[PDB]
């Protein structure tokens, strides 16, 4: 199906403690494969996934150099934002950026994007057209104008359509064995008594991949979506993910409820009661 190449970039100022901390974490779908953390003794781009071993020494050198340049640019950005916003040089601030592109199963571009955030809030973003930018406030407008005169939109678009799309294909080719697999969910249910003749029914889904999954509780064949409690699908540190969803029921009426689990690795939805 569709696949994606995303990068999570964060830059944080820490007044009185030295240089800002810079980071770059890349993902191919729900799999982290590259990383850069300026807080390493000797900052360098490192592989996070096995298959990235298929890249020669020159790859890591260029990515490391590019990453360091990126780090400098953001160090400047944090400085600029203080002026744009007329803020003190003693406070801590955060710049966040998410950049990526997605391709269909045929390898052609579905969509690309790049969005910035300053201290937790929207700053500027490239519109789906990949031609123009949209600013959250007047500060980001200054940026919008600047990039317009410099032709930034056009440059970034070249990256999204070319560089981004071409590197994603390669990565999928090299890690096909890992990025194209399908780990099927193993599910089970736990029971927990509560005050006032009611028990808690928690449904677990484990060791699956990719991350996208659906957990629902039912009664009479109807879904109790709004009365369920659940956590966001999460990584289990081995490339797989897990998730649980619960519902409170009447003691003696457990067998009445069933958990339904739909996943790319489940030819037919799982069904289980307590």
């Amino acid at each position: 199906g569709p696949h994606s190449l995303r990068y999570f970039v964060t830059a944080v100022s820490r007044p009185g403690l030295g240089e800002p901390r810079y980071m770059e974490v890349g993902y191919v779908d729900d799999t982290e494969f590259v990383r850069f953390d300026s807080d390493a003794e000797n900052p360098r781009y490192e592989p996070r996934a096995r298959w990235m071993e298929q890249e020669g020494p020159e790859y890591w050198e260029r990515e490391t150099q590019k990453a360091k340049g990126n780090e400098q640019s953001f160090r400047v950005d944090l400085r600029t934002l203080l002026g744009y916003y007329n803020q003190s040089k003693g406070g801590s601030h955060t710049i966040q950026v998410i950049s990526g592109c997605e391709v269909g199963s045929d390898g052609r571009l579905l969509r690309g994007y790049q969005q910035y955030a300053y201290d937790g809030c929207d700053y500027i973003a490239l519109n789906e057209d990949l031609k123009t930018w949209t600013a959250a406030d007047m500060a980001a407008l200054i940026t919008k104008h600047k990039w317009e005169q410099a032709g930034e939109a056009e440059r970034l678009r070249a990256y999204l359509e070319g560089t981004c799309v071409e590197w994603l294909r390669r990565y999928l080719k090299n890690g096909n064995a890992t990025l194209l697999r399908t780990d099927s969910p193993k599910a089970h249910v736990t029971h927990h008594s509560r005050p006032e003749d009611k028990v808690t029914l928690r449904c677990w889904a484990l060791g699956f991949y990719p991350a996208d999954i659906t957990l629902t509780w039912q009664l009479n064949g109807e879904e109790l979506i709004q009365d369920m409690e659940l956590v966001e699908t999460r990584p289990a540190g081995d490339g797989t993910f897990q998730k649980w969803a619960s519902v409170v029921v009447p003691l003696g009426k457990e067998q009445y409820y069933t958990c339904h689990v739909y996943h790319q690795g489940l030819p037919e939805p799982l069904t289980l009661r307590w």
Binding site: G69, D77, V97, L156
Partner: peptide
């Protein structure tokens, strides 16, 4: 390969 970022 991540993009090349330039000042805002």
């Amino acid at each position: 390969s991540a993009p090349d970022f330039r000042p805002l």
